[PDB]
Design a protein around this nucleic acid. Structure first.
Ligand SMILES: O=c1ccn([C@@H]2O[C@H](COP(=O)(O)OP(=O)(O)OP(=O)(O)O)[C@@H](O)[C@H]2O)c(=O)[nH]1
Ligand SMILES: Nc1nc2c(ncn2[C@H]2C[C@H](O)[C@@H](COP(=O)(O)O)O2)c(=O)[nH]1
Ligand SMILES: [Mg+2]
Ligand SMILES: [Zn+2]
Ligand SMILES: [Zn+2]
Lengths: 74, 49, 48, 1269
DNA sequence: TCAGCGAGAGA
DNA sequence: TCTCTCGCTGAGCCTCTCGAT
RNA sequence: AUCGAGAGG
């Protein structure tokens, strides 16, 4: 489903070129940082976990910015 | 092309007038070329090499 | 993927270490173009 | 760490400052030892040490000693890479002129000084440069500029160049070189060789010669040689400096060992092999491979199969890293060795690695955007890449040994970029038009329509079934045939309910195969999409409907299911081609005999002196084209209809099951031309230049050709192959010019807010609507007054995008024409806004921000030309000539209408057309315009205007071979300006019934006869001049060249009686290769060379026509605004492209047209700083005017310019793009003279320097950088 | 080689 | 003011093999 | 790395 098509993934964002959200922050902090994935992995490689997260609706630019602000304080 | 004399024409594409410009060429097996051609002014002109 | 001396090594090390992050620089072809144009006698430079 | 590129002239002090080493005296290179000789072109003190962290002298060789100079040689220790950076200089005894400034352009030195180029040329070559340097130093710029202003074209050029020097700060004396720089050593390598000798580059020997001549001048002047001899080798030094940089411009280019000209510094920049177009706009990348492609029809639409041997090499670093992670290896070398040994752990790791990384596949010619796509890879055992069958039509990829190349994305963002924008599941629709690209073809259609086609009295006909499952069971069991006509209870879902699906079940009369086919369609589509024989068009329309109604994922699933079912049932079909399948009719020889009789009569006519040669040629070619069309029709009828089967003991006819007819009717592969050449006449062949009418090839490919016919046929094959191999270059050049002219504009804003736009109206060509109004405005936002044909009531509001339902609403009320806003009439700066462009055709909704429109438009216009050029030899070289229509018959009944007509009534009373651009429009009774026709000069209309005409009636009759001249007024004819042997020729035929005068051509006319212009003037019976109704001047007709007159002087002629006939040029074989030069001329804005006269000032109205003829685009622009020229260019280009059948949307041509016109000439300066009439960029003028209006001052007034794509691309704000396009020397020297600045705004400006392009995913980064400033 | 375009020639 | 010789610019993409400098 | 000659798409 999500591995084949990302139409539902981009419907939440509304801009196809706004994949910087999916890659530059979410996938990177999963790969390098200690951040834990939200949805179950299902043995999927990263960058497909993030796309699934945006497809369901946990990850968006405002949410990631808010979380970043949360770890800004101490 | 065999050595000898050959008469050719530019088919009118040389100038915007469209007049055919006939010319002759003497091609040797060994030596220098030699051409007689016209101009839209209707004058002979010899070209060497 | 080519023409940058430091980017190739840095990205190779990053891929080996599992980090898929690149730090691009300026290609050497632009440098050689600039050097040969400067050799030709026309001053060309990068201003900041 | 930079934001701009600054280019200017180099002062001698700057060059002296560049050098790290002292001087360049000794001319030597190497070979004193293996160490390089002191002070040579490869040295140590000057250009740095040769060995890393080790000096040449050998005192110290440790990085702990880095930063110390040497003692034996004085060479500082540094990493050897610095040899790629350092420079040096040569001091010339005598100053030498730079050839770039003196030549290769309107001479800069020749415009600083008034005297022409020849004087300076003779001065430099001593037939001296010091004199030119002294003269350049002598002038003062401000005084001469003030003088030149005092006298006040050439003076404007001189003053602008002087002001360029004044502003830029480049002193003229810097033009003459005093010190010459040298390249770094590693930039011109001394490449090692297997043998003892070392290969030497061209630059080293040129530098060596220059040093030799300079050092000769150094010692000779020191010895006080006589003035006669000192001057001679100064010319040689000038020639050597000429050879070193930009060799070959002064003539007699220096040749080395062999007879090949040497390669100079300026040859490393310009040309195909220069750094711009070989190492900056295209590179050789790592992590890539190449291999042949096979079919592998077991894949899904998002998958590609690649070999294990390729993958194990492509993904080596990932394998190394994960082997280190698993703990199997402790270092890189151990994991490497494990990789060469190819153990099982390596294969398991590789299977884990390639799980979700997509890979990019591209073919060799990347004509358009779909030529590169991202696929999910699956490992296969073999050596060839497996590619999905549906994708091939996008790539233009067959399996005749064709190859492909694969790259692997490396980083995270690259993987997401490939997954979201590159993956093949996203590319469903082409960016050039709304039609989809993944269309089943060949075997898939072959199976599909065979499933859906019906037969009479099959096995199991007349049966009632529960549903599709019972149909499949009956077919697989063998109790019923696949073509049986049955009744099935089928259930269908519809989405007519608001946001919901509702079901309805009914008994429908169908066939078994259609019942099985019904089982794969997705929920929510009507049955009637599969209750018919599915050709290629039907399947494509079904896929388009599925995309429109349901979405994208159901469309992908449906495409995969369609491919699988088509393959399976095509295989089970067992359809084969046989020699008994091709059938020949019996009318063929009859119609060939009658055509032979006709052409023999034409030859007899030409034997008499009544007709000329070209007219006979045209007549014969038309006769044979008509005969070929007739034989094709008769044979296709015989193939189609002739199948008779009996039902319950009575005969009946049906559509044939013949293999060839099925193959042709399918549209899978083949056309009517191939079938007609297999079973009719092969036709008329076309030479590489034109057509040939030698003989009719009255032999099929079933019954073999003889020797003469095959020899004739070889001409078309030669023509096709030559056309392909020698017009692909022209097509590529046009595509490159379009790309380089329209590379810059991107979407930048959402809504500019303007109101105006162009008016879209339906277009028809003689009774068949090629483009209806629906697709003319499909996806374009409305501009103004789109209200329905009901007064004061609006059907649709303003500034809304037209969907499919909106278009259906327009069609239901039958709107005639609609005004829509376009790209050209946009007010945004440095780009276009989203709304004016409209819907992007690839995605299906409004265009987002940051999509590069220009590249898409250029590729869309460029692909069809080269593709159709390459596909020329498929048809076999047959002439694509359609017989010209002698008359016009209206298809449907309606009122007659004549537009822009000037006509006269002859004795017969028929309306004789006397205007060049008369048009006939067919209008129905209600008032809608139905059909449009073009009426050539001299046509006669049987029925007068204003009388209703029934269908099938004849409207006009004319001869297309000759264009007559018609008499306006009745009177006696008098010959004028006719002299035999000077302007006309007279002959009397022996016995032909006619004696005629042929007007001599202007080319053949003698010098004396040019002043006299031949003409025919009508006179009164008494000898006076005839009076035209309401005209001051009498009637006279100017007979042009190649005119024929049978009339004699003093003969009374009736009104509307032809006098002279002008035979028309043949111009046969209308083809894509025959039409592309028209497109190139249109986009280059070339002069028609016979322009039509347009009234500049109304008082006659503005834009009217005075004398008929071709209309130049410049006149149309400057008299009617940008909208009219946009309409003209778009209509002409679409007219050229429509004959071949390729579909290109208008917005791309509109984008190109807007891209051409960017410059303006200012007529009144106003309060701005621009002076008089200058060519300046339009946007800068717009901001200047807006600022002046803001500050309460007077704005400027200006007029457009129109420039060809080459000139427009060569004249832009940025100089890097212009240099990288072509004519590098001119652009580079002009930029150096003017001291220009580059802001790196476009695409190539960032691509060359290696940054994120300001489009797509780099738009956000560019916007952040801009907002920071 | 063919096909165009700009600057310089007289007429 | 203008019609003509003469010069310089350009002319599709990717890949494979051999020899000879 | 060039030049020349083939060949494939
Ligand atoms: O000079 C050429 C020749 C060929 N090609 C590329 O190869 C294709 C033509 O060569 P093909 O033989 O592969 O295509 P084809 O299907 O039309 O020929 P047949 O099988 O019917 O015999 C072209 O479409 C182009 O992609 C070029 O790009 N340039
Ligand atoms: N690649 C290559 N170039 C060579 C070889 N031998 C000489 N050359 C080059 C160096 C010079 O440019 C030129 C000298 O040729 P000469 O023998 O005519 O040819 C060789 O074996 N291989
Ligand atoms: Mg092929
Ligand atoms: Zn030392
Ligand atoms: Zn706009």
């Amino acid at each position: 489903m999500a591995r084949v098509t990302v139409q539902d993934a981009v419907e939440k964002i509304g801009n196809r070129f706004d994949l910087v959200l999916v890659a530059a922050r979410r996938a990177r902090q999963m790969q390098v940082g200690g951040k834990d994935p939200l949805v179950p992995e299902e043995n999927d490689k990263t960058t497909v976990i993030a796309l699934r997260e945006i497809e369901e609706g946990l990850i968006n630019n405002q949410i990631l910015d808010v979380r970043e602000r949360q770890e800004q304080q101490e | 092309r065999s050595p000898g004399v050959f008469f050719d024409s530019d088919k009118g594409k040389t100038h915007s007038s469209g007049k055919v410009l006939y010319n002759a060429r003497i091609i040797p097996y060994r030596g220098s070329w030699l051409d007689f051609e016209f101009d839209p002014k209707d004058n002979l002109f010899v070209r060497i090499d | 993927k080519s023409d940058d001396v430091n980017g190739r090594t840095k990205m190779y090390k990053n891929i080996v270490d599992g980090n898929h992050q690149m730090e691009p620089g300026m290609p050497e072809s632009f440098n050689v173009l600039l050097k040969e144009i400067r050799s030709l006698g026309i001053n060309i430079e990068l201003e900041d | 760490e930079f934001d701009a590129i600054k280019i200017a002239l180099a002062s001698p002090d700057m060059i002296r400052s560049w050098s790290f080493g002292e001087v360049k005296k000794p001319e030597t290179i190497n070979y004193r030892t293996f160490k390089p000789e002191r002070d040579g072109l490869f040295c140590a003190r000057i250009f740095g040490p040769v060995k890393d962290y080790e000096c040449l002298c050998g005192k110290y060789k440790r990085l702990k000693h880095r930063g110390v100079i040497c003692e034996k040689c004085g060479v500082e220790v540094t990493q050897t890479k610095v040899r790629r950076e350092r420079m040096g200089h040569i001091e010339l005894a005598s100053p030498t002129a730079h050839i770039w400034f003196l030549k290769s352009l309107p001479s800069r030195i020749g415009l600083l000084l008034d005297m022409p180029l020849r004087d300076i040329e003779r001065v430099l070559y001593f037939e001296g440069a010091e004199a030119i340097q002294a003269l350049l130093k002598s002038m003062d710029l401000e005084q001469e500029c003030e003088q030149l202003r005092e006298e006040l074209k050439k003076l404007t050029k001189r003053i602008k160049l002087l002001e360029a020097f004044v502003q830029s700060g480049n002193k003229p004396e810097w033009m003459i070189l005093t010190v010459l720089p040298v390249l770094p050593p590693d930039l011109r390598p001394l490449v090692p060789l297997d043998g003892g000798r070392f290969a030497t580059s061209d630059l080293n020997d040129l530098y060596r010669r220059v040093i030799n001549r300079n050092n000769r001048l150094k010692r000779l002047l020191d010895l006080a040689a006589p003035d006669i001899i000192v001057r001679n080798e100064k010319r040689m030094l000038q020639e050597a400096v000429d050879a070193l940089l930009d060799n070959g411009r002064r003539g007699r280019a220096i040749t080395g060992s062999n007879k090949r000209p040497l390669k100079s510094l300026a040859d490393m920049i310009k040309g195909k092999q220069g750094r711009f177009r070989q190492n900056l706009l295209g590179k050789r990348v790592d992590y890539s491979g190449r291999s042949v492609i096979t079919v592998g029809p077991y894949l899904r639409l998002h998958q590609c199969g690649l070999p294990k041997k390729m993958a194990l090499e492509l993904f080596k670093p990932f394998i190394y890293g994960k082997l280190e992670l698993r703990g199997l290896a402790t270092t890189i070398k151990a994991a490497k060795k494990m990789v060469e040994r190819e153990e099982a752990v390596v294969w398991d790791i590789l299977d884990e690695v390639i799980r979700e990384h997509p890979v990019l596949l591209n073919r060799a010619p990347t004509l358009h955007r779909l030529g590169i796509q991202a696929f999910e890879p699956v490992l296969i055992e073999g050596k060839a890449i497996q590619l999905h069958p549906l994708v091939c039509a996008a790539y233009n990829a067959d399996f005749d040994g064709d190859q492909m190349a694969v790259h692997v994305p490396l980083t995270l963002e690259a993987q997401l970029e490939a997954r979201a924008l590159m993956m093949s599941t996203n590319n469903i629709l082409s960016p050039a038009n709304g039609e989809p690209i993944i269309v089943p073809s060949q075997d898939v259609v072959l199976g599909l329509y065979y499933m859906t086609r019906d037969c009479v009295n099959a096995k199991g006909e007349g049966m009632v079934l529960t549903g599709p499952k019972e149909a499949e069971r009956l077919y697989r069991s063998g109790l019923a045939s696949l073509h049986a006509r049955v009744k099935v209870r089928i259930t269908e879902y519809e989405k007519d309910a608001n946001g919901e699906l509702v079901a309805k079940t009914s008994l429908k009369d169908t066939t078994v195969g259609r019942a099985i086919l019904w089982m794969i369609v997705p929920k929510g589509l009507p049955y009637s999409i599969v209750n018919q024989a599915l050709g290629k068009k039907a399947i494509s329309k079904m896929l388009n409907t599925c995309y429109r109604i349901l979405g994208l994922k159901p469309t992908v699933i449906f495409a995969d299911q369609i491919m699988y079912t088509g393959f399976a049932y095509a295989a089970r079909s067992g359809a084969s081609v046989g020699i008994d399948d091709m059938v020949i009719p019996e009318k063929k020889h009859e119609i060939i005999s009658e055509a032979e009789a006709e052409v023999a009569e034409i030859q007899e006519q030409f034997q008499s002196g009544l007709v000329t040669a070209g007219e006979r040629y045209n007549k014969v070619i038309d006769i044979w084209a008509a005969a070929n069309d007739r034989v094709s029709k008769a044979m296709m009828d015989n193939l189609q209809t002739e199948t008779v089967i009996n039902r319950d003991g009575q005969e009946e006819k049906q559509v044939s099951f013949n293999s060839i007819y099925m193959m042709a009717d399918s549209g899978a592969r083949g056309s009517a031309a191939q079938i007609r050449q297999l079973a009719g006449m092969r036709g008329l062949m076309a030479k590489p230049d034109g057509s040939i009418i030698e003989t009719p090839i009255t032999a099929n490919f079933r019954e073999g050709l003889n020797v003469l016919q095959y020899f004739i046929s070889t001409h078309g094959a030669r023509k096709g192959l030559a056309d392909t191999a020698l017009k692909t270059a022209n097509s590529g050049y046009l595509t490159r010019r379009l790309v380089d002219v329209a590379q810059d504009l991107v979407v930048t804003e959402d809504d500019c807010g303007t109101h105006e736009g162009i008016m879209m109206t339906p277009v028809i060509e003689g009774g068949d609507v090629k483009e209806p109004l629906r697709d003319r405005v499909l996806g374009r936002v409305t501009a103004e007054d789109v209200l329905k044909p009901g007064t004061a009531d609006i059907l649709v509001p303003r500034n809304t995008l037209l969907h499919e339902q909106w278009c259906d609403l327009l069609e239901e009320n039958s709107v005639d024409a609609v005004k829509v806003r376009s790209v050209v009439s946009c007010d945004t700066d440095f780009g276009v806004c989203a709304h004016c462009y409209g819907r992007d055709l690839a995605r299906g909704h409004i265009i987002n921000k940051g999509e590069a429109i220009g590249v898409i438009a250029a590729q869309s216009i460029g692909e069809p030309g080269t593709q159709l050029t390459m596909r020329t030899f498929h048809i076999g070289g047959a002439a694509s000539r359609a017989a010209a229509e002698s008359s016009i018959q209206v298809k449907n009944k309606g009122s007659i209408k004549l537009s822009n007509v000037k006509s006269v009534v002859n004795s017969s009373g028929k309306l004789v057309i006397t205007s060049r651009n008369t048009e006939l429009k067919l209008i129905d009774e209600f008032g809608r315009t139905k059909e449009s026709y073009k009426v050539p000069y001299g046509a006669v209309l049987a029925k007068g205007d204003g009388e209703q005409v029934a269908g099938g009636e004849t409207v006009a009759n004319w001869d297309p071979h000759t264009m007559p001249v018609i008499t306006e007024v009745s009177g006696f004819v008098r010959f004028t300006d006719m002299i035999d042997g000077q302007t006309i020729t007279r002959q009397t035929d022996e016995l032909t019934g006619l004696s005629s005068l042929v007007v001599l051509d202007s080319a053949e006319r003698t010098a004396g006869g040019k002043d006299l212009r031949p003409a025919l003037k009508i006179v009164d019976a008494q000898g006076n001049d005839v009076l035209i109704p309401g005209t001051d001047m009498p009637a006279q007709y100017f007979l042009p060249g190649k005119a024929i007159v049978q009339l004699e002087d003093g003969v009374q002629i009736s009104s509307g009686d032809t006098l002279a006939r002008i035979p028309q040029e043949s111009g046969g074989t209308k083809d894509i290769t025959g039409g592309l030069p028209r497109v190139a001329d249109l986009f280059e804005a070339r002069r028609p060379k016979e322009p039509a006269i347009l009234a500049e000032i109304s008082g006659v109205e503005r834009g009217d026509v005075i004398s008929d003829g071709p209309e130049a685009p410049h006149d149309i622009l400057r008299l009617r605004g940008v909208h009219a020229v946009t309409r003209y260019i778009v209509n002409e280009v679409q007219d050229v492209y429509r004959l071949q059948g390729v579909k290109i949307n208008d917005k791309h041509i509109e984008v190109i047209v807007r891209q051409m016109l960017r410059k303006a000439t200012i007529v009144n300066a106003g309060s701005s700083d621009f002076l008089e009439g200058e060519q300046v960029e339009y946007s800068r003028v717009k901001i200047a005017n807006r600022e002046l209006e803001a500050n309460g001052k007077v704005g400027a007034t200006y007029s457009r310019d129109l420039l060809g794509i080459t000139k427009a691309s060569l004249a832009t704000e940025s100089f890097i793009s212009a240099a990288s396009f072509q004519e590098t020397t001119r652009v580079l020297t002009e930029a150096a003279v003017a001291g220009k600045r580059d802001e790196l705004r476009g695409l190539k400006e960032n691509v060359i320097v290696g940054r994120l392009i300001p489009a797509g995913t780099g738009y956000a980064y560019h916007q952040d950088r801009m907002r920071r400033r």
